[PDB]
Design a protein around this ligand. Sequence first.
Ligand code: CYC
Ligand code: CYC
Ligand code: CYC
Ligand code: CYC
Ligand code: CYC
Ligand code: CYC
Ligand code: CYC
Ligand code: CYC
Ligand code: CYC
Lengths: 160, 160, 160, 160, 161, 161, 161, 161, 48, 193
Amino acid sequence: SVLTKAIVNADAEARYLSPGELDRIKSFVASGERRLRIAQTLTEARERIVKQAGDQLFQIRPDVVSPGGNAYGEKMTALCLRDLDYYLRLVTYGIVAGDVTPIEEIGIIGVKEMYNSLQTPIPAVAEGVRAMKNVATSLLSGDDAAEAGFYFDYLVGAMQ
Amino acid sequence: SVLTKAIVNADAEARYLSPGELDRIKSFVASGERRLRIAQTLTEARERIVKQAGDQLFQIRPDVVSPGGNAYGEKMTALCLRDLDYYLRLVTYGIVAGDVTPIEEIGIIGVKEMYNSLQTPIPAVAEGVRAMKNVATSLLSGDDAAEAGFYFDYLVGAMQ
Amino acid sequence: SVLTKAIVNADAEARYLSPGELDRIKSFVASGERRLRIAQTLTEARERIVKQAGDQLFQIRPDVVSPGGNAYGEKMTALCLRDLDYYLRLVTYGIVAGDVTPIEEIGIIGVKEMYNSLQTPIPAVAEGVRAMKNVATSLLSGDDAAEAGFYFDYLVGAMQ
Amino acid sequence: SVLTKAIVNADAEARYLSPGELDRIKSFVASGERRLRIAQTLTEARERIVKQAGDQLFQIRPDVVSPGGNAYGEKMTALCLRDLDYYLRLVTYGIVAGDVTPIEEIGIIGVKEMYNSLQTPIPAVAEGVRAMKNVATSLLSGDDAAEAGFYFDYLVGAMQ
Amino acid sequence: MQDAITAVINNYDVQGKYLDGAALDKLKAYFTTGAVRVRAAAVISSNATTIIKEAAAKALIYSDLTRPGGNMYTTRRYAACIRDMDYFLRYATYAMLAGDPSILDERVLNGLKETYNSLGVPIAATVGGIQAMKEVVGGLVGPDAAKEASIYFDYLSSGLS
Amino acid sequence: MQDAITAVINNYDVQGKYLDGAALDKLKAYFTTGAVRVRAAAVISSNATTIIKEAAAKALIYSDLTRPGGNMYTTRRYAACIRDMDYFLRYATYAMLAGDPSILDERVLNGLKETYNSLGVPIAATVGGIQAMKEVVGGLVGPDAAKEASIYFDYLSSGLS
Amino acid sequence: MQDAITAVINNYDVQGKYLDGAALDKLKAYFTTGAVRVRAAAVISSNATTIIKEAAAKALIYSDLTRPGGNMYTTRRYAACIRDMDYFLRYATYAMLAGDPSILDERVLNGLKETYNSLGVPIAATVGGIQAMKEVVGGLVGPDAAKEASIYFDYLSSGLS
Amino acid sequence: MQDAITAVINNYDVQGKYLDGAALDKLKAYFTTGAVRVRAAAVISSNATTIIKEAAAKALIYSDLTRPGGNMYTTRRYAACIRDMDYFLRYATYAMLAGDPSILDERVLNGLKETYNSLGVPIAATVGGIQAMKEVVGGLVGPDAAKEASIYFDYLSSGLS
Amino acid sequence: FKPIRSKMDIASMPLVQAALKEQQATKTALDMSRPMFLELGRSFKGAD
Amino acid sequence: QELGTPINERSIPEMYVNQGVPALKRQRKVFKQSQATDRESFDALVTAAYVQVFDKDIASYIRSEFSALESRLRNRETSVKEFVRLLGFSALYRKQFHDRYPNTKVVEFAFKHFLGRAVKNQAELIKYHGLLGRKGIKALIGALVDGEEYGRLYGEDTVPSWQFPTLPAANYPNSVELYNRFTRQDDSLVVPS
Ligand SMILES: *C[C@@H](*)[C@H]1/C(=C/c2[nH]c(/C=C3N=C(/C=C4\NC(=O)C(CC)=C4C)C(C)=C\3CCC(=O)O)c(CCC(=O)O)c2C)NC(=O)[C@@H]1C
Ligand SMILES: *C[C@@H](*)[C@H]1/C(=C/c2[nH]c(/C=C3N=C(/C=C4\NC(=O)C(CC)=C4C)C(C)=C\3CCC(=O)O)c(CCC(=O)O)c2C)NC(=O)[C@@H]1C
Ligand SMILES: *C[C@@H](*)[C@H]1/C(=C/c2[nH]c(/C=C3N=C(/C=C4\NC(=O)C(CC)=C4C)C(C)=C\3CCC(=O)O)c(CCC(=O)O)c2C)NC(=O)[C@@H]1C
Ligand SMILES: *C[C@@H](*)[C@H]1/C(=C/c2[nH]c(/C=C3N=C(/C=C4\NC(=O)C(CC)=C4C)C(C)=C\3CCC(=O)O)c(CCC(=O)O)c2C)NC(=O)[C@@H]1C
Ligand SMILES: *C[C@@H](*)[C@H]1/C(=C/c2[nH]c(/C=C3N=C(/C=C4\NC(=O)C(CC)=C4C)C(C)=C\3CCC(=O)O)c(CCC(=O)O)c2C)NC(=O)[C@@H]1C
Ligand SMILES: *[C@H](C)[C@H]1/C(=C/c2[nH]c(/C=C3N=C(/C=C4\NC(=O)C(CC)=C4C)C(C)=C\3CCC(=O)O)c(CCC(=O)O)c2C)NC(=O)[C@@H]1C
Ligand SMILES: *[C@H](C)[C@H]1/C(=C/c2[nH]c(/C=C3N=C(/C=C4\NC(=O)C(CC)=C4C)C(C)=C\3CCC(=O)O)c(CCC(=O)O)c2C)NC(=O)[C@@H]1C
Ligand SMILES: *[C@H](C)[C@H]1/C(=C/c2[nH]c(/C=C3N=C(/C=C4\NC(=O)C(CC)=C4C)C(C)=C\3CCC(=O)O)c(CCC(=O)O)c2C)NC(=O)[C@@H]1C
Ligand SMILES: CCC1=C(C)/C(=C/C2=NC(=C\c3[nH]c(/C=C4\NC(=O)[C@H](C)[C@H]4CC)c(C)c3CCC(=O)O)/C(CCC(=O)O)=C2C)NC1=O
């Protein structure tokens, strides 16, 4: 989180916390209520976002649901939707934490290796993540929409 | 409104108003308070009807929110939701006025040239309107629901 | 004329012409051809203007052609029409000259004593001049119409 | 300014503004953009014009920067160049106003008495102003050059 | 042209605003006075030619207008004047039913003053006839709608004058 | 007295500043509305007596002011009131032409309050008449110069009040 | 209407003169640029609706003109505005093909200014849209016909202004 | 005395009008500048003595004022002059907090001039001291409230002179 | 004691006048924290 | 650059614009018959002569009472000096500026209207008030118009107009106080003695 990053930086430098670091600490704690509200909204709308993102992703990449595709079949598509739910949960974790430490340590480190082993289209994962981004942003006010879109865009970029 | 449609024909043939016209004005004026109460609930549920309608529209056809779609992007989707809100407002206008004069003069005449220049799917817009009809009917009593459904039905018919 | 007024105000200070008054002189000479064209156009249609304006004046103010009216009788009406023709000639002179110097010396100063001695209604003469203005502006282009209407308005206000 | 001089005559004669005065006001406001451009150009070249005017003035008559000269010494030469800056500002004010009332009220009436009291050579000051005119006209197009040269010649004539 | 309801709807559509309490109050205000307007219009339609007859006899006829040299002289001009009176009464009925003077401003008063000035029509006589038919309709309609009927006749008279 | 241009020039001269971007923007803003001021001034000059007549009819006459015991009773006081009314109109025209109330403060408002207190003139009635010409001039000039004409009438009314 | 050839022919017929070296030179000057005009006309005919669409995107929509209260607000007004744009494009194509703004004066410019004045159409916004169409057409056609097409768009904008 | 809030409230009470959009805009514009005034007043209060010392050193002392026969000669008059400078600084702080020079007019300037001619105090020297304090205060308070602080010192100097 | 009146309008002060212009711009130009579909269908003028 | 900047920054401009003599000293026009030829300019001279005398307030009431004087002036039978003198002989001037004031305020009103200043000193009050009471207005006006000061300042053809005197002492504030007074605004005599 923000506190973890500030603490690790001060420890690596071998000094006490900078006043600007305390400034970002105070801003981060003051933004706690709004971040919790955004996380609550996304958690309550977790099913709709995942389902709609799946439908939109299958429209741009119809071949993934096809005979020579990774997600061919009802349970193979269910696994893809469960993956999208996992990434939605990780985005909620990142929003509540204030940075992308949990998202990084859970879902992008080695994701290329895992999906390469599974023979899974990663660009299709990225398209699904973008679809979840659009569906989630449709359910939020503008400022919170940009705040969540930051983490969704980071997930899209890191999955490349 | 009913007044304009019942006065224009009288001016056209050059006579004073006929008793059928007068008594249809009586039915219209007697239904005035119930018309106002009907229109008030739709304004209470303005920003909550459009969110439900957008989800059903995009679930029925996700291709408009696809990369080759007209509504691709956050701001494109916001514009479509704004147009749906516009048509909800026009439906409230028609409900209160008792006819379709304001609806026609504001948002149907030339709408085909509108959406052809913008290259927007008019049949998609029709399903978007029908979603608003269903969500509005879900929050009204049966007689009032049918009354609003008449104007939603007219908008859907004129849109295509 | 503009030349006359510039020369007179320069001679008031007993100094050579300032450059600004020279730009006055160039603007006036450049507009002089258009002014003379407008005056010739009004000159070609002098009889129709006075006739229609006299009809308009007698419509608005019928008391002057009433038994207790200054212009009661056919010869008294003919004298009124001759006065209107005089004012039209003065307006054409003003338009060609550019400055209103001839009109004031010919048919403005002393006109109060004019119509007080003759017992003629000055407001009625004003109404006749306004009708002349309308009929004259009906036969001119918009810029030319405004250019003539300014002098007509001077006549109406200066007979106040 | 021309507005002030027209209003002063109108109030002295106790009457509304004449059509000639209104026309000169109109031309005066029409010329405003080119006047503002000329004033802006002179304002941007303030330092260069002043420095070059001082250099030409001292070349033409170096006796003023001699030991027995009025402007001998660094702190005395600074005041002479500041006076030249004052007159350049007055010229820009005159150009923007359209005539020389600001120049008269601020820098010429009593200038003979002040410079006689300070024992400075008024003919030297006039040549210094003329050098400023030459440097200023070096940075302007022909029409704007003549327009500024009018005010510069006014200053040169007044300091005489 | 526009009625009260369409006028309020247009006045809110220009601002891009939903119908709120004040606008619905205006609409309910028009809705409450519905009965008097249709009853006044029905009685006026039933008594139109009688109204024109009394208005003519009370404001125009038995005067120098009907005699030679007047504007109302000759059967042609008399028929023109009575047709104009019937026209005015009909459009006043329309404006009373619609609750708005827009129809009168559009289809009646537009150019009428200048055309009557060109044709020599007596504007004062026209206003007197309009007020006479206003009086007769106020008598006929009863207390329910006499005031509403009178307002648009006053509007026509004021626009002409 | 000062206009907009001379006001800017003096305000910069007292600080010893060359005309910068802000002063140039102020002068540009004045110059962009030069023609409308001239047109409105010409209209007011042409319609001067009618503005006074309708303003007096709307605000002063047909009341106790014109009756015995009123301040504008008798021909002398009526003429004095209309001459003052015309003074206000002419100086408002000067202010709207110059774009500055400096002339109004310099040549009209100084000593006016205590002069009217000495003579017994009703200041409230004077403010009413000034607002009367404000409405009339706003009707005459049109949308273009209505507010700019109105600001100086408001200046005169606030100075008297 | 008339093209360059017809204009020269009429200007010599009004003197009753057979064609001389100067007229032949003018005809040669027009003939030397015939191919580029036809190419630009074909490109404009191909991309007419696209030219309108990016023209509207850069100049008109996403502004107060589209919001409630804009002149192009409502479907009817937007359809009328885009029809006006396609009219301007077609007549500019005609003018550039004929090498003469006579057709633009005869069938486009006359009446249009006061027509927009009566309708309330923003002339400045229309001129801006015409300029956007001009720049799109110039970018599309290439250096060969850019100035030749742009002169008629400037003619239309100047006639409107 | 009166601040910005009471000035708006009194200006509306004299008309007997409820608060409208303009009054609320004025009140919001005052409320937004709340913390800046408090910070500037705190800085001035903390640095009061140094401001007086520096202003006196720059403008008054080391001259004929403090040498014998001068108006600031003797401890009895030196203490009085520095007390007067303290009074001016304190009331300038009050005026800056209130956002209105009404306190300066009511409790500083009235009778002050004729008091100074009665005592023999040099008005020009007092004005010079006030401007020196103005320069020092503008240096201290920062760019946020420099103009706001300087306006009241200029008000005091113009009232005295 | 005579009333001392007021010669300087409070809205002409540097801080208040500097805040009024910002108040105008913030209310007219920019949007805020309601949904964009609601904020894209707004007419900034009220009766013009 | 900094040697021409104000020092003690003028934090409120146009509080320093108005200092010094008023702008009215140089923001008004002087009228001369010698350069007032032609009908348009002659009317301005005539209407200005009714404002120097009569002090601009009861001058607007004048419609046609002085019509024989204007005719002779236009025909060049009498000079502007004669016109101004005959304007002070009329019953309107006597009614307005002599019939409601003490005999010494008539001297002050006569000075400010026909010379442009107030009374110089006590030795001039004694001369010009001991003549007005001896022979009335028609001698006091003749003494002012035919004096050496009038001949120096205005000569034959020139409207009197306000002058802002520098000397002698207390003639500038005394004159300016008279200048900035509307008609009937204040009737204190300013310079009693
Ligand atoms: C619209 C007509 C109005 C009107 C007029 C009227 N005029 C007269 C008589 C005269 N009018 C003039 C006018 C002029 N002489 C000039 O030099 C000029 C300037 C160019 C003018 C305008 C003169 C000289 C006369 C006298 C006769 C003559 O010309 O020799 C009359 C007749 C009055 C009589 O007593 O006979 C009338 C009626 N009357 C109206 O009702 C109209 C408003
Ligand atoms: C009480 C009647 C008064 C009167 C009237 C009068 N009118 C005419 C002629 C016309 N009236 C009209 C009117 C209209 N045209 C429109 O479009 C409308 C609104 C939709 C109106 C009201 C017109 C156009 C004419 C001229 C053509 C025609 O006659 O139809 C006349 C005839 C005059 C003539 O013969 O030229 C009269 C007499 N006259 C009075 O005295 C009454 C007061
Ligand atoms: C609408 C008329 C109101 C009114 C007015 C009234 N005024 C006077 C007398 C004077 N008014 C003036 C005014 C001015 N002198 C100036 O120089 C200017 C500005 C340029 C002004 C406004 C003056 C000086 C006088 C005194 C001299 C004079 O009478 O001319 C009077 C006459 C009072 C009397 O009889 O003594 C009246 C009646 N009265 C009303 O009731 C109206 C509200
Ligand atoms: C369900 C949504 C569909 C869709 C819509 C879409 N619309 C636009 C752009 C505009 N739409 C309008 C609409 C109106 N103007 C009016 O006056 C009325 C009547 C009340 C309407 C409905 C306008 C003016 C625009 C232009 C932009 C603006 O408003 O300023 C767009 C954007 C197109 C672009 O090129 O940016 C879209 C996407 N798209 C879909 O796929 C749906 C079917
Ligand atoms: C060292 C100069 C200081 C100064 C002075 C200043 N004075 C004026 C204007 C006037 N001074 C007088 C003086 C007198 N009245 C008398 O009777 C005489 C003898 C003849 C004296 C000495 C008067 C009457 C005036 C006003 C009329 C006039 O200008 O002649 C001015 C000019 C003010 C202006 O133009 O508005 C100044 C500058 N100013 C300083 O800064 C010095 C301390
Ligand atoms: C007589 C044998 C019949 C009859 C007639 C009758 N007429 C009136 C009233 C009017 N008649 C006219 C007629 C004309 N106006 C014209 O311009 C022309 C063309 C030359 C005609 C014929 C008019 C204008 C009137 C109204 C009054 C007026 O002139 O001002 C009446 C009176 C009706 C009333 O209500 O008072 C009568 C009785 N009556 C009969 O019994 C015969 C059949
Ligand atoms: C009657 C024979 C003539 C006539 C007169 C007329 N007067 C008015 C209105 C007013 N008349 C006065 C008059 C005076 N006020 C005074 O102090 C004196 C001196 C004693 C007089 C004579 C006034 C003040 C008014 C205004 C109203 C008021 O008194 O408050 C009108 C009305 C005009 C209007 O537009 O309303 C009329 C008609 N009209 C004629 O035709 C006769 C020749
Ligand atoms: C000397 C033993 C101590 C000392 C003195 C000191 N004084 C000043 C400056 C001033 N002293 C005065 C004094 C008086 N003014 C009066 O009217 C009287 C009564 C007769 C006195 C005693 C004044 C007015 C000044 C200001 C300058 C001026 O006179 O114009 C200084 C200079 C302070 C400075 O420059 O900031 C000093 C140093 N300092 C010591 O340490 C000694 C113990
Ligand atoms: C929270 C971190 C995390 C993730 C993400 C994760 C993912 C994950 N994705 C899986 C399968 C899968 N994932 C995909 C994904 C896709 N197919 C496409 O076309 C696209 C490129 C993409 C969807 C947009 C597919 C097709 C499978 C099934 C592969 C198979 O059955 O062989 C599996 C194997 C089955 C199982 O879950 O037991 C895992 C573990 N596990 C974790 O712990």
